[PDB]
Design a protein around this nucleic acid. Structure first.
Ligand SMILES: CNc1ccccc1C(=O)O[C@H]1[C@@H](O)[C@H](n2cnc3c(=O)[nH]c(N)nc32)O[C@@H]1COP(=O)(O)OP(=O)(O)NP(=O)(O)O
Ligand SMILES: [Zn+2]
Lengths: 323, 123
RNA sequence: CCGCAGAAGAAGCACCGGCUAACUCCGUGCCAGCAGCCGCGGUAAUACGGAGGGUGCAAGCGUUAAUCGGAAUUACUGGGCGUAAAGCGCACGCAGGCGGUUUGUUAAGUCAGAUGUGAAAUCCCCGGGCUCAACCUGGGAACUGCAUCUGAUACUAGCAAGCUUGAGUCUCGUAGAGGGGGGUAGAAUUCCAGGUGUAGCGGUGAAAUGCGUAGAGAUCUGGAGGAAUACCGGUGGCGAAGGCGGCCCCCUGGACGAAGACUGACGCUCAGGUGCGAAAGCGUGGGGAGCAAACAGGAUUAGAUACCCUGGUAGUCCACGCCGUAAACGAUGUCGACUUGGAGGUUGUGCCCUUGAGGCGUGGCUUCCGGAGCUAACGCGUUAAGUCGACCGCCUGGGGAGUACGGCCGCAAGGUUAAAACUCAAAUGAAUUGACGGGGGCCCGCACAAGCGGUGGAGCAUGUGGUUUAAUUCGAUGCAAC
RNA sequence: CUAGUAGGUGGGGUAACGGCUCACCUAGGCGACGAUCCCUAGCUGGUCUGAGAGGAUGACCAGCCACACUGGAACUGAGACACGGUCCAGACUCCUACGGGAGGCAGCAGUGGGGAAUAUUGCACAAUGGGCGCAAGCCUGAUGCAGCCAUGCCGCGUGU
């Protein structure tokens, strides 16, 4: 890996794209004309790419590609013309600059963008067995930081009841109070599937939830053809296409939105609400904890700031230094 | 060690595992492709290869590398194997002769033209 | 064979990164491609493509396929299994393998001669003939066997006929967790009937189920029982191994020493065969203290069908039977004899003013250090992994796969035996150096610490980053940018 | 594990010893010194390799054996259980006046086909060899050659 050699190399790969696009036959013979595509499936060593034509091609990925991931739309080739026609045979000559995308946190292994070109990131979730706002709280900051739109969807609502929902919806009202988008539904039950469908209308976004939040239900509910197995018990990079438009990078991980450490002054910018809680405090450097005359504290224990949000926000900062 | 033992069991050396089994000391065999597959190289040693499962006559499929650079192979395409192995492509153990049968020589290599059996130039 | 033309009709292919003899220029830029191997190529590549130049090889060349050779890479010659693959847990013994010391003996083996036999062509020694060579031809040599004959008689063999140091035997002692069986007690604890007594107890880094005023916890007394048998006790002992620990009795095995007397090679090893097998589980039937898979609660966590807590079945102990695996380990086959030692361990004894605890010897074995020696190393090293011999087992790269299939066994698990395909190209060892630790220890400095004055709020200046601008010049930023 | 199995009597049969055979008798015989059962294989002198011993083999030439379309048969005969004889059943094959018949390329050459691949349906009785023959000689795809193959080997050369 060579930042320098990597650099000079970058320019080369870039030119290769524009140069190849200039026009074809000089390129030719083994492979066919270049075309655009996005990465639906990751074969570790291969990738399924959907072409402009709309037909997916499993392709090789020339070493010259530092990396690739799902949600990556860009130029591509298959082998020849003839070669795609017997058996999905294609190769990815180069990629495009991911306009909108996000990565996963990790521990040893470094942050890796999960998907690119995202208009909205709908946080799944599920009532079974029990939610944890924390997971959603940390996710809220991510959506703000990548400047992506967030949709929280309390799913599997059909599983709740009298003393079950009256505590679910309300408890989630927080999102409806601070201006967030949410739509209670139950894949098993197909309820509130109208609102979501419209929300996903003309947009490029995807859904990720925590361990077992009904991600397979919703993705399989909106549009499911010859493939409805991704439920079933409690268990587990392909970005599937939508029934009403939009795609959703599903890989068995993403739904488990962890939490990575970006900066120590950003955490305060995570929530817009803080725009009024970070005005005047007791200590110029008051981390908002046990200071005398704080602002965020005087608001929390005052009824305006949701206590639950305080504990979660404070825990997030203590989670980073966990390294 | 002992005699005793030796008289009972003979010593035993190895019997070599034949790297190929295009066999009956195959020199060459016609096969017919299957299709022209494609597979990745090896972890650091990376190159794409035009390779192809071959429907050999003795009955054993196996994918061969298609030598050189230049090409002319279809799915259905009688072909001629030789051994080999692309030491960087699993499953390769052969090598379909270039210039044989269903292909001629590639364009204009000059060096070692017998590999990639090519004519002599005009001189 | 004679002749005549005329340079005329006639050189190729591979290879040149390293191994492995041979180097440059371009193109290409982990792409296209290579290739036996290690590996090459992500902007000057001796390895890709092209070019040149050199190296080789020859009418022929390369490549592929093939066999061995290399490979001592199954190890007769000529390996290895303490830790790198390899000693079966462990034992016993029939086939078998191996054999103390004398003589006689046969002449079986051995040997030796000899008598034969061992097509020819290869081959070889030697020669000759085709212009050479290949080839061909002649001659010799050789073809290293079997057989027979005549001996040779050291050893091995068989028997015979002897011996004593092997072995075995009798005798006399020792020590010893050797076992098996049946007794029996204490320590402790579960549980109990109660005494006392009280809020809480119990549990935990914190907590909760649970028991807790129904009197827990705690205390005391008695009792019931279950399970296992401290201190001794050990670097200890005994045992074939696995292992075997309270005291007592009964039945029983082995080891060792000493005067000795006795026998007379009766021995060593051992495939198969036989029996025994740490813990799981099985029969069936008991039991059930403690502990504890399963299972159930409580907690932890992002989750925690985990670690922790209350616990709790199975199990555990008893029997019985069946099950047959152990890093069944000193990671060290058996039996034997040798070769340097020092301190040591536990048991025996002779002798010696034991006059003492004992001194000087003398046997057993086992610890720790250890020479030569041996060894890749580490290391080992008279208890050898040295030097040897004999026997027996095993190992033949990695995964594959201790699996499949067969087998056999088996209640079932399952054991056992044990492959293929393939795939990999190295795995593996140890030793060496550094780096490495939420390893440990050892130091100081304004590190802390001891104080001083600070900085931090507040108003103002540098700057800088955000943000903004037509431009807000360019670089410096985890302490080491401001 | 072996039944006509092991022997022993009897006979019978072969050119000849024998269970070879029939009949009779006995009840063995065999096995780790791997019987038998299975897989695969022409054998051998050699051949290649290796310092050797060994290892791998078994084309070409020579000794042996066995087979001649699938099978099962004897006969004939010096001699055969007989490639280019015989009969039967058999599979093909083929012909046919459908009644029946004909066919045997593990010869030689050629063909198909098979395959990675392996050559002419050539010539000769001159020599050597053989059959038959009283020689004469006839016959002889043995054989001598000739054709093809850079398949290997050798040499020569392609210029000094
Ligand atoms: O059981 C299945 C469902 O039947 C059930 N499930 C899904 N939707 C619903 C619903 O609406 N209601 C109920 N009761 N169950 C649901 O929830 C489970 C999860 O469904 P999954 O689709 O696999 O969820 P992810 O794809 O998000 N998971 P990962 O990110 O790891 O891929
Ligand atoms: Zn504050």
């Amino acid at each position: 890996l060579s930042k320098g050699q990597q650099r000079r190399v970058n320019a080369n790969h870039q030119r290769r794209l524009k140069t190849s696009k200039e026009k074809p036959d000089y390129d030719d013979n083994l492979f066919g004309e270049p075309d655009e595509g996005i990465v639906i499936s990751r074969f570790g060593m291969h990738a399924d790419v959907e072409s402009a034509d709309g037909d997916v091609h499993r392709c090789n990925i020339r070493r010259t590609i530092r990396s690739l991931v799902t949600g990556d739309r860009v130029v591509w080739r298959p082998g020849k013309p003839a070669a795609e026609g017997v058996n999905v045979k294609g190769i990815v000559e180069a990629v495009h600059e991911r306009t909108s995308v996000l990565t996963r946190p990790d521990f040893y292994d470094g942050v890796k963008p999960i998907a690119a070109n995202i208009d909205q990131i709908v946080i799944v979730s599920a009532i079974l067995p029990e939610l944890s706002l924390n997971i959603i709280d940390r996710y809220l900051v991510a959506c703000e930081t990548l400047q992506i739109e967030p949709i929280i969807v309390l799913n599997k609502i059909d599983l709740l009841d009298d003393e079950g929902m009256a505590f679910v919806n309300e408890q989630m009202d927080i999102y409806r109070n601070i201006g967030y988008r949410v739509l209670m539904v139950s894949s098993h039950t197909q309820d509130g599937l109208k609102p979501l469908e419209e929300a996903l209308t003309g947009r490029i976004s995807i859904f990720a939830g925590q361990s077992g939040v009904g991600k397979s239900s919703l993705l399989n509910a909106l549009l499911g053809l010859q493939k409805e197995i991704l439920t079933n018990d409690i268990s587990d990079a392909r970005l599937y296409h939508f029934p009403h438009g939009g795609d959703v990078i599903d890989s068995p991980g993403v739904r488990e939105f962890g939490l990575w450490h970006l900066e120590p002054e950003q955490i305060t910018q995570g929530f817009v609400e803080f725009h009024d809680y970070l005005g005047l405090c007791k200590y110029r450097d008051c981390k908002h904890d046990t200071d005398p005359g704080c602002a965020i504290r005087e608001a929390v224990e005052e009824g305006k700031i949701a206590e639950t949000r305080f504990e979660n926000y404070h825990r997030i900062l203590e989670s980073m230094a966990q390294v | 060690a002992t005699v005793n033992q030796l008289v009972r069991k003979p010593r035993a050396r190895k019997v070599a595992k034949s790297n190929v089994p295009a066999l009956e000391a195959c020199p060459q065999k016609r096969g017919v492709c299957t299709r022209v597959y494609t597979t990745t190289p090896k972890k650091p040693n990376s190159a794409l290869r035009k390779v192809c499962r071959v429907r050999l006559t003795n009955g054993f499929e196996v994918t061969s590398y298609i030598g050189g650079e230049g090409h002319n192979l279809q799915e259905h395409s009688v072909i001629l194997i030789r051994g080999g192995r692309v030491k960087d492509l699993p499953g390769v153990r052969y090598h379909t002769v270039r210039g044989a049968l269903d292909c001629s020589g590639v364009k204009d290599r000059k060096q070692a033209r017998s590999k990639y059996g090519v004519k002599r130039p005009k001189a």
